[PDB]
Write a protein that binds this ligand. Structure first.
Ligand SMILES: Nc1ncnc2c1ncn2[C@@H]1O[C@H](COP(=O)(O)OP(=O)(O)OP(=O)(O)O)[C@@H](O)[C@H]1O
Ligand SMILES: [Mg+2]
Lengths: 259, 44, 493, 468
């Protein structure tokens, strides 16, 4: 019983499964069981598979409940090809790689979106999010591809320069601070603004401030656009002219008023 | 000037390969030691 | 209860069933039998129930099953005293030079805890190695643990031998422990020590490559026990009692290899690089006994010069880093400098002595601080040395001066330099008094200057030696005397 | 009580006791050893019919089988209280200084105590100014929180520790405890003694406020294994009565190595590179006692030695998750003559938060990391091609990164013995201002060689003016 509603969804975070594997190795070696690879016992994949396969989304006949698991693993010197990291990568349905190189470079969430994957895919996104983030993923992937030319070449055409600029816009958009989550309507609004060229004239260093100011705008000036976005985020065609208006209008008003 | 720069770059590239090969060999031996340790431990 | 019988001989370890009332590191005897006139000893280590594993200090093919063993009642010990001076001995203390039996009145047990923390004092008395670069940039004090780390044929043994040779009149008891070195190299080292007359105060402990892995493992401890006896009790050298000793462990990498072989033949679990997990404890308990005791514990000292051989100049290996962490400083002998002609090859950029900088003669430091600074400037300017005619007068002069100083640091083998000669040469070099001398002839210029001071001006050398302890070395008298000497030499040349 | 020794394997002694008087798991048993002095062993395991396996924590190389062992019935007890101030102790609590033994009236506390519970944990922390530019800017020394420096063999971990003590031990506002679980008896101790006795706080030396427990490298594995616990028991008395404590444990890795050797002699199955299977639990038991609680605060500062130069070694990997501020010393930086040798990219801290350290400090640190992150990204490009191929802004960031790397170097007052440069104490405010000015663009004209071993930015500007 949660907030007067029978909640049947659970979200479990194993703070570190590498330490759990270390504990199992300790208890196995103290029991004098034969070791395996890297002194871990033989059935450590069985260990973690037992642990993780209990996270499931039951059908309506069995209750309709769910249990979301977020295993956490530290990797020594970013060695993904180790034993426990590869085991739990095989077990899980998705991976979120955080890099120290991206973390130091200012990308605070530090996700390596190039190699982070989610096998569930768009089925685990709201229809608004699914409709808006496809262009995000495509543009970010192409920016990652063109970073090779961006690093060296200075004679690239205006198309490539603008495309690198757009990639930088999106990357600076993803730079989220700590303890400031953004609800689904807010992320949808920001990504719609960014992917529809409304953010092109904003310089890169001020994009985070632009997003914060835009969210203050929607939270204060136009709460109704946020309510409208959140209300119909599940429709098959999210960008309906109704949701399309009063949102582009809000972006235009914010752009005209500030800067 | 390009010829001088490429010659310096090729010399630096060849020096880097020698350094990397020196480092790769150390990693190659350490991989063997690790395996010969687990198998011997697994034998006993 | 003092007698037992071997029940299994294997990978250099005997089992010695039924030998109770044996202490945990007793040296068992294996009394001689038919076919074996002499007795080979063993160290009882794993005193498990109804079996006493013993490391055979020697070839393990000599003993069989059923051999009688007699416990000697002593923890493993090496004979030590004044009789050891001038003798080449086995790690067990038995002589190998053939001169005659070793005379000794007392024995000091190897494998003992180091004196401790309170029983120590900061080093103040310097050690004169005789190498310009070492004595000017990496000072060594009595009781300091200085590591000589290089890459195979680079001169670590040569540096140790030069340091041993220079301690002729310094009241030091040199000890050279050869661990894992081939017999040819040990013989050449002993012959070189004999030729220069340094063998009169040098004790050599030899555990060669052909010897069993039990040896090459207790040899450094035998040498360290000898050094400890010199440090605490002392011996009479040149009619005077000396309590200061210098010990060179030579290749400690081969010592670690021998201990690894002993451990793996005992089926102990391997660690990093297949070395046993206690190899750091091995070398630490070996080197920690080299201390500079305070006055109230006798005031003795024991300088240690371990030698570590690296592969492809890989200073970040296991054993080299272990020994670096144990010791007080490093002497990096780079192979590139050695091949380039700088025979006393020292990586001055990274070689350092954490302690002993204050344990230096005031003259040497007062003349060598600016030497080190100028060498640092030359190293900084090494990047710009490729450019031609693109450097101003200051940078060109600095590069030329650095080249001159490096050429001066180049010192031929087997020729130690007294402290007065070293400080005079550095004072000459660092006062713009050699800018006119061409680089290729600086070595012969230094040789001629030293010969001139030996022949023409012994009083200048004596005055410098007597006034090397003053707080302000460049006193007007010595300054004017040495300036007059160098002006005379330059005029004559 | 009154058992007999069965086996003596290394420093591990297996003894047989009567069936109904078997010692507990952590009891301290003793061999009379003759001569009137006894060897105190610590039980570790119980094997069956009155047979226990104990760690000698001593020479254990001159005693035979069948020797009697006396069971004290209590774990190892060490004196605690003001009587331990200004004294030097063994792992057993026996003083080793010239002064007399501790009186029986002084309380003896077991060295095996449970760490503070979850309720007692104190999460409040704030920046502890130390005067070192790289430490106070990138990885702030956390007051009331665990912090440690990870260095190889050639880097100056001991120099950094000694300079830190010299900077912060004078204004202690409380007592302090030093524990060299594994370290040279030359510079780790008997030279810190001279430094601490030389320093004077209003006619009372710093050593008069310090408890020092060594168990130096020379000691057998048992002493190095339990000396950390002895120091922790000596400091927990002062923490529990409210006194602020500075705790300096040197080379936790030596504690781990002693545990590894003891476990190898104990017959436990080896794990990873020969380490003990119980590595994580031993680290937890030692480290969880180093916590600032609601009764008092412990400002711990540890040191960790990485074998070879491997940061993936199990011991440093276990340490990394038990710290608030992590400082990483790199071999390459030290070989580049940068004596602090701290890698800003691999060194982090928990209190590097704008609400705790200051908004300007946080922004400066983040920029000083984003620079040198660009430099680490362009390292290969620079190495194989050169500076020319980079863009203008990339070039400028690269020389700014090199200037920052040079500027993190700082002379230490304890470095006078081998370097003639006088020591400098740069306050955190001055460090932040200097790095902000350097990042703004000021100092671009100055060559990189002028930032080497200087104080704040004003000293660099003064040196530039002196050289014109
Ligand atoms: N200062 C020097 N001047 C000239 N030759 C030198 C000098 N130092 C060493 N050598 C030469 O270098 C060679 C090797 O020197 P040394 O015998 O000291 O070996 P090492 O580098 O210590 O190691 P190893 O024992 O593995 O050969 C010899 O030919 C020796 O004559
Ligand atoms: Mg040699």
């Amino acid at each position: 019983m949660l907030n007067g509603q029978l909640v049947k969804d659970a979200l479990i975070v194993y703070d570190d499964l590498s330490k759990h594997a270390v504990a199992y190795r300790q208890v196995s070696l103290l029991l004098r069981r034969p070791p395996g690879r890297e002194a871990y016992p033989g059935d450590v994949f069985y260990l973690h598979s037992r642990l993780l396969e209990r996270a499931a989304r039951l059908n309506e006949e069995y209750g309709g409940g769910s249990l979301t698991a977020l295993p956490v693993i530290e990797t020594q010197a970013n060695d993904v090809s180790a034993y426990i990291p590869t085991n739990v990568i095989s077990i899980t349905d998705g991976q979120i790689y955080l890099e120290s190189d991206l973390f130091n470079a200012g990308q605070r969430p530090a996700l390596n979106v190039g190699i982070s994957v989610s096998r569930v895919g768009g089925a685990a996104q709201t229809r608004a999010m699914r409709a808006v983030a496809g262009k995000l993923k495509g543009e970010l992937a192409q920016f990652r591809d063109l970073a090779a030319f961006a690093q060296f070449a200075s004679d690239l055409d205006a198309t490539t320069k603008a495309q690198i600029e757009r990639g930088q816009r999106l990357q600076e958009l993803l730079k989220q601070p700590q303890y400031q989550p953004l609800p689904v309507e807010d992320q949808v609004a920001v990504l719609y603004a960014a992917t529809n060229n409304y953010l092109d004239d904003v310089p890169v260093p001020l994009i985070t401030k632009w997003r914060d100011d835009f969210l203050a705008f929607l939270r204060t000036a136009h709460p109704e656009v946020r309510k409208l976005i959140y209300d119909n985020r599940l429709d098959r065609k999210f960008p309906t002219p109704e949701v399309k208006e009063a949102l582009e209008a809000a972006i235009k008003e914010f752009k005209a008023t500030s800067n | 000037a390009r010829m001088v720069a490429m010659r310096n770059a090729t010399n630096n590239a060849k020096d880097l390969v020698r350094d990397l090969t020196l480092s790769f060999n150390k990693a190659r031996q350490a991989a063997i030691t690790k395996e010969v340790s687990e198998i011997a431990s697994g034998a006993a | 209860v003092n007698v037992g019988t071997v029940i299994a001989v294997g990978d250099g370890v005997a089992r010695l069933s039924g030998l109770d009332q044996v202490v945990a590191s007793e040296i068992v005897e294996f009394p001689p039998k038919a076919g074996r006139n002499e007795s080979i000893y063993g160290i009882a280590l794993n005193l498990e129930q109804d079996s006493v594993a013993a490391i055979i200090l020697g070839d393990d093919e000599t003993i069989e099953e059923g051999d009688m063993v007699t416990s000697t009642g002593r923890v493993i010990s090496v004979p030590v005293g004044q009789g050891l001076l001038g003798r080449v001995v086995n790690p067990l203390g038995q002589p190998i030079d053939g001169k005659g039996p070793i005379v000794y009145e007392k024995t000091r047990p190897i494998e003992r805890i180091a004196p401790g923390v309170i029983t120590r004092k900061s080093v103040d008395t310097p050690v004169q190695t005789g190498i310009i670069a070492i004595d000017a940039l990496i000072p060594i004090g009595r009781g300091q643990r200085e590591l000589i780390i290089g890459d195979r044929q680079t001169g670590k043994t040569a540096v140790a031998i030069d340091t041993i040779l220079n301690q002729k009149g310094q009241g030091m008891v040199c000890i050279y422990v050869a661990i894992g070195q081939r017999r040819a190299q040990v013989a050449q080292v002993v012959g070189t020590l004999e030729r220069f007359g340094a063998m009169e105060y040098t004790i050599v402990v030899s555990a060669t490559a052909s010897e069993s892995a039990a040896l090459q493992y207790i040899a450094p401890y035998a040498g360290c026990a000898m050094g400890e006896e010199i440090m605490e009790n002392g011996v009479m050298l040149n009619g005077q009692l000396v309590k200061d000793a210098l010990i060179v462990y030579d290749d400690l990498s081969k010592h670690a290899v021998a201990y690894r072989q002993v451990s793996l033949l005992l089926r102990r679990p391997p660690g990093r690089e297949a070395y046993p997990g206690d190899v750091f404890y091995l070398h630490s308990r070996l080197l920690e006994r080299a201390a500079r005791l305070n006055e109230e514990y006798g005031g003795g000292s024991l300088t240690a010069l371990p030698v570590i051989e690296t592969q492809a100049n890989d200073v970040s290996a296991y054993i080299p880093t272990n020994v670096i962490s144990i010791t007080d400083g490093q002497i990096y002998l780079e192979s590139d400098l050695f091949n380039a002609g700088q025979r006393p090859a020292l990586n001055v950029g990274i070689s350092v002595s954490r302690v002993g900088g204050a344990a230096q003669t005031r003259a040497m430091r007062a003349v060598a601080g600016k030497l080190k600074g100028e060498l640092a400037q030359f190293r900084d300017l090494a990047a710009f040395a490729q450019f031609a005619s693109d450097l101003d007068a200051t940078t060109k002069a600095q590069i030329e001066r650095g080249q001159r100083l490096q050429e001066l640091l180049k010192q031929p083998q087997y020729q130690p330099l007294p402290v007065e000669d070293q400080v005079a040469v550095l004072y000459a070099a660092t006062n713009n008094y050699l800018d006119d001398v061409p680089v290729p002839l600086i070595t012969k210029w230094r040789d001629d200057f030293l010969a001139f001071l030996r022949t023409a001006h012994p009083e200048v050398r004596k005055l410098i030696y007597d006034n090397r302890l003053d707080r302000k070395f460049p006193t007007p008298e010595v300054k004017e005397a040495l300036e007059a000497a160098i002006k005379e030499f330059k005029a004559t040349s | 009580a009154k058992g007999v020794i069965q086996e003596i394997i290394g420093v591990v002694i297996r003894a047989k006791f009567p069936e109904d008087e078997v010692p507990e798991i952590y009891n301290a048993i003793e061999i009379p050893l003759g001569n009137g002095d006894r060897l105190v062993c610590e039980v570790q395991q119980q094997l069956g019919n009155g047979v226990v396996k104990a760690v000698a924590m001593g020479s254990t190389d001159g005693l035979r089988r069948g020797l009697e062992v006396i069971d004290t019935g209590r774990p190892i007890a060490v004196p605690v209280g003001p009587a331990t101030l200004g004294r030097v102790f063994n792992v057993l609590g026996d003083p080793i200084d010239g002064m007399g033994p501790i009186g029986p009236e002084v309380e003896r506390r077991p060295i095996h105590r449970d760490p503070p519970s979850f309720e007692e944990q104190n999460t409040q922390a704030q920046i502890f100014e130390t005067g070192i530019k790289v430490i106070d800017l990138i990885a702030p020394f956390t007051r009331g929180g665990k912090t440690a420096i990870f260095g190889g063999a050639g880097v100056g971990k001991t120099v950094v520790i000694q300079e830190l003590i010299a900077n912060i031990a004078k204004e202690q506002s409380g007592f302090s405890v030093f524990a060299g679980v594994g370290e040279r008896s030359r510079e780790g101790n008997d030279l810190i003694h001279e430094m601490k006795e030389a320093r004077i706080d209003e006619n009372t030396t710093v050593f008069d406020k310090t408890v020092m427990v060594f168990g130096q490298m020379n000691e057998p594995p048992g002493a190095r294994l339990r000396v950390g616990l002895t120091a922790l028991t000596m400091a927990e008395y002062f923490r529990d009565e409210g006194r602020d404590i500075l705790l300096f444990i040197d080379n936790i890795f030596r504690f781990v190595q002693a545990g590894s050797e003891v476990s190898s002699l104990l017959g436990r199955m080896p794990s990873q590179v020969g380490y003990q299977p119980t590595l994580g639990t031993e680290m937890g038991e030692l480290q969880e006692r180093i916590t600032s609680t609601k009764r008092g605060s412990i400002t711990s500062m540890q040191a960790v030695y990485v074998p070879a130069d491997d940061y993936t070694d199990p011991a440093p990997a276990t340490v990394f998750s038990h710290l608030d501020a992590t400082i990483s010393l790199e071999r390459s930086i030290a070989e580049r003559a940068i004596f602090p040798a701290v890698d800003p990219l691999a060194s982090t801290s928990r209190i590097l938060d704008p609400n705790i350290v200051g908004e300007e400090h946080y922004r400066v640190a983040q920029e000083v990391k984003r620079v040198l992150q660009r430099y680490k990204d362009l390292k290969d490009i620079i190495a194989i091609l050169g500076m020319e191929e980079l863009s203008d802004e990339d070039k400028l960031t690269v020389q700014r990164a090199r200037k920052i790397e040079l500027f993190f170097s700082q002379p230490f007052t304890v470095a006078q013995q081998f370097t003639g440069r006088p020591g400098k104490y740069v306050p955190v405010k001055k460090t932040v201002e200097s790095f902000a000015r350097l990042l703004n663009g000021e100092g671009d004209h100055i060559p990189e060689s002028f930032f080497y071993m200087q104080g704040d930015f004003d000293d660099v500007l003064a040196a530039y003016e002196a050289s014109q």
